[PDB]
């Protein structure tokens, strides 16, 4: 729908850290499991953020189960873990479900 894009795989990372390159625009990744009780909370949040941002950052989704590849070139640990990613490399990050956080996080990030 043009909100949150999930990643199925490595080339489909690839592809969109290359897009978020290519647009000069950031991209916000969100690193969840269906078993993580607290990342079911904060999707919603993450969701509506995507709508409120849409052209102005790419919202990424990476189940770390269905993606292990991604998951542990990314050095993730702890759910959910939230990534900003400029120019193809890791510009920031954020761990835990921390609501206010993640929309200093995107806001930030939005802006310069």
Same mark, same amino acid.
Request: glycine fraction near 8%; include cysteine.
């Given at each position: 729908?043009?909100?949150?894009?999930?990643?199925?795989?490595?080339?489909?990372?690839?592809?969109?850290?290359?897009?978020?390159? *290519?647009?000069?625009?950031?991209?916000?990744?969100?690193?969840?499991?269906?078993?993580?009780?607290?990342?079911?909370?904060?999707?919603?949040?993450?969701?509506?953020?995507?709508?409120?941002?849409?052209?102005?950052?790419?919202?990424?989704?990476?189940?770390?189960?269905?993606?292990?590849?991604?998951? *542990?070139?990314?050095?993730?640990?702890?759910?959910?873990?939230?990534?900003?990613?400029?120019?193809?490399?890791?510009?920031?990050?954020?761990?835990?479900?921390?609501?206010?956080?993640?929309?200093?996080?995107?806001?930030?990030?939005?802006?310069?």
């Amino acid at each position: 729908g043009g909100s949150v894009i999930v990643i199925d795989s490595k080339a489909a990372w690839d592809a969109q850290l290359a897009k978020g390159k *290519e647009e000069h625009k950031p991209i916000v990744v969100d690193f969840t499991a269906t078993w993580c009780g607290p990342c079911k909370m904060i999707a919603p949040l993450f969701e509506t953020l995507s709508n409120d941002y849409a052209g102005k950052v790419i919202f990424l989704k990476v189940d770390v189960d269905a993606v292990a590849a991604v998951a *542990e070139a990314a050095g993730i640990t702890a759910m959910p873990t939230f990534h900003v990613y400029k120019d193809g490399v890791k510009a920031d990050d954020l761990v835990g479900a921390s609501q206010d956080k993640l929309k200093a996080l995107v806001a930030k990030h939005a802006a310069a």
